[PDB]
């Protein structure tokens, strides 16, 4: 039935979308930490190697 | 595909050593930004909502 | 700060009279999206 | 607040120096309108 | 506040001088560096051994290009040197050189 | 969606969020590439010996 | 194809892993050039000149000057390379 | 001049530039004298930015 299918599909849609948002936020955090680590590695190369 | 190649200086087994020496000054370069602070914003609740 | 700060070296960092030439150049070049200071009302 | 003195000064908005007036009838704040110039 | 001899700090070439101006939400840096830009390969040697207590250091920079034991700085070909570069160490291998 | 046209329609209701997600990921990946390029441009910068 | 011959990237969730922007050969070229420049770049010359000296000499000069060890001690006593090689192998 | 904070030399800018080149630059003081086109190259870099 379309009336009940819309509600079910809507709740699935909202759930998947919010997990996807969480994934994006986590990726941004990890990316910034990795950029800082890259700066540190650049320093280590320049004055240890 | 292309790869930038570093200058190659040969190594001498004799007591003499080969030395690559600069002949020009060519001073100056563009430089990075540090972004020390961010904009200060206050939000009035009970008015926003 | 002296107008002749550098003998044969030329400096555009001297203030024009306080917001040196390079400083105001990069304040103009950037898209200042907030002129609403002091007059936003 | 100026806690040590305990006096209070009502700074207005960054550009609120012509329309605003002390205890103005026009401006009705969400608060009981009891309030708290260079 | 100083040039110094760093590595990953003031980037882009051998740091000479640096300036700072204000910019939206931070500071804008302008580092001036030194760049070699033409490189020629010259044979050089380590030190000299004349007769007694005569060992000579290469100089603050290696220099010691071939021709007249003449010592050289970082820029250009060798120029006449008068102890203004070479102090005096102990000997090393390949005698008549500190090689 | 599993490719069903019905979920596609119900999502076209929401279609701006997908744009935001894709744009955020694309920007992060661009920043990663610039970081790698910068680091390696600061690695070699030299003359070398074979 | 490797998902044909049986990876969730292609199989279900739309997710794709992007390529690294550098193949292994280019990265290896970078690190190899750095290894080639090790001995010469650390030789007293700032960064504007390169002195192509053997690796052993570079090791001796770092130990002789930066470490306060007299030159006679370094001379009397090569085969110190044995200890260096032991450390490298242990790694 | 010397990184030590406690003093101020108050030398002109050209002198400071030549001292910087003499030590970290490793260019002979005589080489700094040789061709003070150095000022021209400095000015070219500044104008380029």
UniProtKB/TrEMBL annotation, chain A:
The organism's place on the tree of life at top rank: Viruses
Protein name in the entry: Spike protein S2'
Taxonomic lineage of the native organism: Viruses, Riboviria, Orthornavirae, Pisuviricota, Pisoniviricetes
Residues of the full protein shown: 1059 to 1107 of 1353
